Amino acid sequence: GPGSAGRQEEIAEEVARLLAGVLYLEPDRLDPEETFLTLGVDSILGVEFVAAVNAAYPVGVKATALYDHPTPAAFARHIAESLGA
Numbered sequence: 040g041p042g043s044a045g046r047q048e049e050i051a052e053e054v055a056r057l058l059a060g061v062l063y064l065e066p067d068r069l070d071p072e073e074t075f076l077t078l079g080v081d082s083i084l085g086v087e088f089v090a091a092v093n094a095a096y097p098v099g100v101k102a103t104a105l106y107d108h109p110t111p112a113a114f115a116r117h118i119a120e121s122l123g124a
């Protein structure tokens with residue numbers, strides 16, 4: 040069958056690609072294990088990343104999830120479980 044590590048891992052990559060797009064960066068040089076604050080997410084860029092995830096998927100996620108999950112690799116697990124992955 041498929042070589043995939045898990046269903047949620049595809050969404051963890053895609054959330055890191057969305058974050059690199061908001062931060063005007065390459066996903067090849069973004070660290071997905073690093074915090075949003077250390078990656079340089081300002082207040083407006085946090086709201087724009089949350090809005091980009093709400094546009095990408097019908098998950099309806101609120102900006103309070105940035106405090107519950109401090110990295111994109113943690114945050115994407117909620118975006119995956121709300122899609123049933």
Ligand SMILES: *P(=O)(O)OCC(C)(C)[C@@H](O)C(=O)NCCC(=O)NCCS
Pocket residue numbers: 081082083085
């Ligand atoms: P960022 O993630 O540091 O967020 C900053 C903020 C959007 C919360 C902040 O700039 C803000 O607007 N806080 C609310 C301030 C308020 O309600 N009243 C004081 C107006 S001077």
